[PDB]
Amino acid sequence: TYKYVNLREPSMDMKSVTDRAAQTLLWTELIRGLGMTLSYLFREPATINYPFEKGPLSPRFRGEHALRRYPSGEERCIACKLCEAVCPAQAITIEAEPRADGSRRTTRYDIDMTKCIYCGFCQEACPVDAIVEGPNFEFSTETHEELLYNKEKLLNNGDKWEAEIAANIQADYLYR
Amino acid sequence: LVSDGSSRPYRCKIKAPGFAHLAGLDKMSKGHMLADVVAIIGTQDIVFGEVDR
Amino acid sequence: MFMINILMLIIPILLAVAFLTLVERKVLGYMQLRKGPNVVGPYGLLQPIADAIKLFIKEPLRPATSSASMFILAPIMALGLALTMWIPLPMPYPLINMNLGVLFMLAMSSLAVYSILWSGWASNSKYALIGALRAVAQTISYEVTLAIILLSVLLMSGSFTLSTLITTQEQMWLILPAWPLAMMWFISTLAETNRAPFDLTEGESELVSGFNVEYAAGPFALFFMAEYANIIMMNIFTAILFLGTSHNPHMPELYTINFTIKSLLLTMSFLWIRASYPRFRYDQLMHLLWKNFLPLTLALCMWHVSLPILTSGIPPQ
Amino acid sequence: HPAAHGVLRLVMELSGEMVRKCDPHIGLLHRGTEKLIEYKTYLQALPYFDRLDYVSMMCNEQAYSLAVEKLLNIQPPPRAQWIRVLFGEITRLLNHIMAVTTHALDIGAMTPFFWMFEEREKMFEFYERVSGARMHAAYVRPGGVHQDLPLGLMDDIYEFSKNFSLRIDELEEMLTNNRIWRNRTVDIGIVTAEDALNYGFSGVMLRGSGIQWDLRKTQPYDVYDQVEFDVPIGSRGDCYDRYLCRVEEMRQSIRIISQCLNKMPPGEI
Amino acid sequence: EYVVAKLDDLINWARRSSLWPMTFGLACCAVEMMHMAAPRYDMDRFGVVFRASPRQSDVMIVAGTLTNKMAPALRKVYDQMPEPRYVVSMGSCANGGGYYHYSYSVVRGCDRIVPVDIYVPGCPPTAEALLYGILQLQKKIKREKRLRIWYR
Amino acid sequence: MNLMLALLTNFTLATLLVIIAFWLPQLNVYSEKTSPYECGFDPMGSARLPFSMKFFLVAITFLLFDLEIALLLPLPWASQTANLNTMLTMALFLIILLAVSLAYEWTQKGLE
Amino acid sequence: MELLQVLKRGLQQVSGHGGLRGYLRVLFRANDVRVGTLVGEDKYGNKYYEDNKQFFGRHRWVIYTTEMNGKNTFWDVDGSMVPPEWHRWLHCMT
């Protein structure tokens, strides 16, 4: 339907002109307007004190990468080549080989941390539930030669915590 | 969004504002000051990367 | 020991412009609901002594297409008249007893615009060439808004000295018999000394164009410094003129205590205006001087001529 | 610097003091977009529509998913339509916070920028709890919403959205009856003719100047017919009365949110 | 000696007490920087005031995405900055270009133009991993200019 | 004899801090590119300063309003006087003589 | 008369928390000067206090102490020193 805003004439009589000529000349606006609305400084400021206090997050957060493994270790990956076919940005670079025991595994596994556009399409394409976007934004290295990840970074980075990650996925696998 | 019939699409042409909202600044600006021009642009809510239409 | 008095006045006031830059943002911060400088102080209080040394380490380039003898002469005349104006000013005793020194304020406040005409010309092109020409143009027009209503209280004071300006206000706090003039006294100094709502001077000024646009932090360190020395000096000049304190000869100690508390309060307003109001879009800046400010100032001028006569209340001198 | 933070180089042969000739240059962020979607699939090339605006997150992907469901002959299921409206009418409280603040920062008002973004961070919280992430969420799909929203968000949208009409009652006292901002914006940029439709404009800088029309109640999207609201119009044809649509639409978006919490059917997604 | 190397416990503290960032807000990582100047994770008054002019700034922060038509306008602006200058790139497009790494109109990396100090990864980094980014930059300042003139 | 040593202190402290801040680290041993990049964002700018009429009339108009405040300046000294009907009726003349010079020019100012 | 009506609470808050030395020792790192209500247990000496539920966002503040694995005395705190279990707690994720 409709609504009309700023469609109204002034009253234009003897009374209300003095109501408007008290505004322009002796400033009944602009002090009652914003000498009071601003101060109003007497609220408590809301500043996260960052090196000690940190802010809220959520158990589906996206961040640093990881590769989990089973109870007593098996390197949960099986090199099934899906986490590399739905990266939209073509970050993953897998090259498998039949490992000597007979079960197949990776040899090289490479995730750029610069082409990584942070979908969550690796996290959800995996059948065997291995590669997980882990919940730690701790980053900021100083060389481009470093942010390229190998296989044997991710496991170290994926076994620095699993008490962190496995508390998250157990809360959230019930929806997906 | 022209789709051919397989998994990868054909042309995908986006229409966004900024083509209309900013071709019509040259009409809109003539006669006023220079310090009126910065007052004009804010009301169209121009967000770039959307002039990538 | 006259020479030890002058250095006892230049040095304790460079802290009060350095410890205003810190209170520039703490006061402007709690309006935004956020704390002050939190980590370096402990409370902030040690910020400007760290924020001063960085400027004099950082390389003071001169521009290649600049002139030479003009570019490095305007910061000489910047701190000269920003600190010379503090001389004839009673608190309660001035350093110098000028016979007529109220006029000497305008003899000092007139030449400050003759540095902006230098620095806008002395260095370089269009972002300060024409962009500083229209900053001299606003500051010249707000003397005739200023010099008239500065004279409009002197018909009631009696003379030109400043010791009579404390004597005549022992029972009045003279903002009451002249409160229309006291309004336009404020906005003039709010726009002449190049501040936040009427702000085509500094950095809000097309938001890109200033006279600070070219000075690296060697010579730039004074411009800001010197400038902040005007703004606490029109505040120390308003509160000796309208809102005058009481002087006791047997107790001069209680003068300054009750005095510095007042100039600080008016100095808060230059911070407290900036966090409310937007700019004025250079036409409407000067559109309200002639058309709107000026004819009232002549009206009260003719009012303050006749009213000392037709009251038979001539001030004595 | 920040006239849009470092883009838009424009030339102005200014006629003395007036401009009378102005012709900008775009292409400083081109990136090769439409060339590059030809080499992806449908689901895989979805997060390059989210990055096509900046600030609309769920308003884009609402017009990609709806443009692929048409080609498939599939409608979304009923709960998948009352989720899209609760987000597609909550990004209209984000694109209108920015257009009324950064406009009034270029002019020079300091605080309503800070006064609203301090409040705005209660609302980037809500993306993280549902999708997983901060701004660019790949959430909407060509078959409805990805996954279900957690236990919550109805005691937390309700605590939020019952207390937003006071925050929008501050900008009315900052800006509307303010004199200096009214002086900065009245009768400025009055393009109102049928050359303001020959140029092919979409909404506001239309309906804020005259012609009442918008595609939400002259075409359908979704289960979107089943809400009731009115579409604000402007009287004259300037910036101050296309400003007042954006203040007034934010009050009307609270009505379409409060009408959306009552109606969600439980079911699939 | 103990006299000279003590003096860089002040100059290398004065240089890290107040950084003045230029920023190049180009794309989506502009907005997620503006929330850091918003008073929740308030950028200013934890040492580092927000934006200034190109003549006065110490430490610039590249964001967004560098195309071909911005590549000379970056390098020109980098020249005017003073001698103790530093470059931080935020965003995952000033690290090798996000996606659009394979499309024709993108400078593939922004290290190919300027030397950049601290790389911060993430489509938009959450203004939480950017205070951790700059608190890595202050920890980088452990260098000295003493024991250079005093050794050689 | 201190007036005059009340300011030559203040200017020799002023010119002290300039040369120490500017000229002393101007002799430092850095690379110091002297290339013509020192001008900001108006690269070449191959033009002369053009005349602007609306920014000349602002100079002359002020000058003719500035003179007769110095006539108006000895009004407080014109109080303790003799015959004062003359003193009042002449003081009111100049202000009106300033006021008419508005109203004629007020019918044509321009975008000032 | 609020100059003593509420300073009486702050008098025991400011002064009687660690005497003369325990007050200014936490003041020289930031303005984080309020003693928290409860305590954490873990781990080294870094009792991660949890406040009296009278805040949100600033109600879970931590303290660092000295030299986790090769650091300086107290003048290098980077924030990544935390154990990978308080990530489930410090960030209010559960």
Ligand SMILES: CCCCCCCCCCCCCCCCCC(=O)OC[C@H](COP(=O)(O)OCCN)OC(=O)CCCCCCCCCCCCCCCCC
């Ligand atoms: C780059 C570095 C190189 C430049 C270095 C030099 C820069 C100097 C610039 C300073 C400009 C200030 C000039 C101000 C002149 C006004 C002085 C004045 O009027 O003093 C007031 C007073 C009037 O006399 P009165 O009040 O009656 O005394 C009381 C008697 N019962 O008068 C008196 O008290 C005494 C009057 C005589 C005092 C000596 C004369 C004063 C002027 C000396 C300096 C000459 C001016 C130099 C040129 C100025 C250039 C800007």
Ligand SMILES: CCCCCCCCCCCCCCCCCC(=O)OC[C@H](COP(=O)(O)OCCN)OC(=O)CCCCCCCCCCCCCCCCC
């Ligand atoms: C018969 C007996 C004798 C009778 C005696 C009667 C005495 C009457 C005294 C009246 C004279 C004093 C009042 C001064 C006049 C006010 C100045 C003025 O005229 O401003 C007009 C200005 C023009 O704009 P406008 O006309 O409103 O048109 C736009 C509307 N869309 O519109 C405006 O309002 C502009 C407002 C000011 C612009 C600057 C605002 C920036 C912030 C300033 C805040 C200052 C706060 C106070 C200052 C400190 C006070 C201590």
Ligand code: SF4
């Ligand atoms: S995590 Fe899954 S998709 Fe990735 S390599 Fe292992 S099995 Fe393949």
Ligand code: SF4
């Ligand atoms: S987050 Fe997305 S783009 Fe990044 S590696 Fe995983 S699937 Fe690929």
Ligand code: SF4
């Ligand atoms: S890829 Fe990252 S930096 Fe580039 S526009 Fe998207 S969010 Fe911003």
